Amino acid sequence: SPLLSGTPPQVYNFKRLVFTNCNYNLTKLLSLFSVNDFTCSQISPAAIASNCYSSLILDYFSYPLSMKSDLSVSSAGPISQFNYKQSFSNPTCLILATVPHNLTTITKPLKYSYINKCSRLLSDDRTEVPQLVNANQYSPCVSIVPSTVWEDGDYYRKQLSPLEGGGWLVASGSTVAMTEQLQMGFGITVQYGTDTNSVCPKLEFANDTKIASQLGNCVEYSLYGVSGRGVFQNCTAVGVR
Amino acid sequence: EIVLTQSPGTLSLSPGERATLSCRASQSVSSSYLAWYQQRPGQAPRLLIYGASSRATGIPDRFSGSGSGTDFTLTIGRLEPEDSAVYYCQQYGSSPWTFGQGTKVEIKRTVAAPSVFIFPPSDEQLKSGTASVVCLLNNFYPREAKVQWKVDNALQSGNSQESVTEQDSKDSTYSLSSTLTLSKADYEKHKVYACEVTHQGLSSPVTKSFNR
Amino acid sequence: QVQLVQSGAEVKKPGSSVKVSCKASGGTFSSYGITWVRQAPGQGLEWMGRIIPILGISRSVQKFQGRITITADKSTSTAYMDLSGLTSDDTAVYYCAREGGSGYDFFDYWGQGTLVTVSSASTKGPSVFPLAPSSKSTSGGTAALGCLVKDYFPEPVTVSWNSGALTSGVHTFPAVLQSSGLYSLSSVVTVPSSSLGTQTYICNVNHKPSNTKVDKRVEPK
């Protein structure tokens, strides 16, 4: 539900939703979008729809289809290196979706911006060390870069307080033109458990396994952990409900 | 892109008088995103005010900065003769960053009865080319000085060319160099050459004499 | 506090290429852009572009886009523009200036400036002209003498006296166009050293295009 409101944040400032105990129907979400690129690594794209995990992590942001190439473990550009890197250790699906007209309250950020470069200029003479984002890490240059970058190419720098470490955590930002429909990117990072799994598809039983439409037949029953075999019937209530 | 107005432009003010410079913006800019610069006669512009409020590190706090949203005013509380310069308001607020038209400050101190000298042609370019005489008018205020060449006691046409230097940072005075280049051969019977000066300075037209 | 030292008046032809080189005296391009700023002769400053050698990023104004490449060599720490494909209308003095970042892009320290002069006419040498001090002048205060520079085409010519020593009464007048595209300017100095004079072997002139230097001695006639 919180995914369907407000202005979704830019790529380097992706919000997170961690689900450690619930039942998920993903197609009940993807039906609400017009899915465009469903690419998954270390688990099949269909397999991410029905199997139980230990924790399901979902990240969402605004990412145009113009540069779907940058967002994967393949690229060496700035999207996967200074903006958003997802763990290669555990399974990972990546959806690149689109908002439809008939959907409401998904408001439009003015433009898609990303951190082009993030370096540190040492407190010594002129030595430079790039900053490479580890597993999700919010890209430590995120302090200077505002939520959205203003112009085509900008330049944000700060001076770390002396020791630590005298090095200008310099950063730059670059934007891309607006598209008529908000084009979003989602990343699911599921990881299994030792022997406990607590997020599973919501599987509902049908009227075959229903007490009604079976009155008068000898049936097996399993009600809230009490199992046996018998015949159910309709009668006036007794005992405490 | 923001076209922007400035102050009236050339300003005549005595030392110790407050000076106000305006900077209206045609398009709205941020309340504090404009920087007032000062460039001296013949040099590179030096930052005076940044953000329309703060002062540049090492700028005497006569140069107050204020104004917000549309109109930005630079007010110089006291004026010395080392303020004669061109001031530009740059709005680093929009894109691309548009410099101001620029205002010229002229510090109004003295009227400097001028000093007129001739430097008549000598035998180094009287041995090639076209010679030229010259009239130096050293130390004079203000720029309202006119020089007409007099040749053999006969007045001359518009074949002159007068160049006047900008006021000195401390002297605040305006020196001139009216020149009369001539055909290299034409120095026969024109025994005398002179420049006639009319100024706020000195009662008369101060004419001169060459002979030699 | 880094002083910025630039290059010298390129004279190019309408349809050429100029690499103006701004040097970062210190050895230190820190987190600090170089922004370039035009100024047409007798006019008001513009913006032309910005770079950061720390990141190699460059940005240019829309009008000058497709004609300008602003680069910098972070290791040797020297920044350059290269205005290729330029017309006669770009004859202007170009400054290089230090950025500050995103919300603080005011131009702190500036370069001396490098006048590009672009028209296929000529390059002509500073023919220095007679000085000839006036005899009967002031009673000692100001004995005026000046070594004139006429007949040269491309500006600049800096004329210091005493090779940059006598800096106290060197009045220099801006060059004014003559009948030809050439223009002329005059240098004068005041001496109290009336008869003889101490240092009178003076008048160094430097022409940036021609690279011709002329020194002459003043004699009271």
Author numbering:
A (entry chain G): 386 to 626
B (entry chain C): 1 to 212
C (entry chain A): 1 to 221
Verbatim from the authors:
Coronavirus trimeric spike (S) glycoproteins mediate viral entry. By combining cell surface staining assays with cryo-EM structural analysis of MERS-S41 in complex with the MERS-CoV spike trimer, we have demonstrated that MERS-S41 inhibits MERS-CoV entry by blocking binding to the receptor DPP4.
The four different classes we identified showed that MERS-S41 bound to two distinct conformational states of the spike trimer. State 1 represented a conformation in which just one of the RBDs was “up” (42%), whereas State 2 corresponded to two “up” RBDs (58%). The MERS-S41 Fabs showed full saturation with one Fab bound to each “up” RBD regardless of the state of the spike glycoprotein. Besides binding to “up” RBDs, we also observed two classes in which MERS-S41 Fabs were bound to a partially lifted “down” RBD. Notably, the partially lifted RBDs are incompatible with DPP4 binding. In our complex structures, MERS-S41 Fab can bind to “up” or partially lifted “down” RBDs, indicating that the neutralization mechanism is not only the direct competition with DPP4 but also potentially able to stop the conformation change of RBD from “down” to “up. We therefore think that MERS-S41 recognizes an intermediate state between “down” and “up” although we cannot rule out that the Fab would induce this transformation.
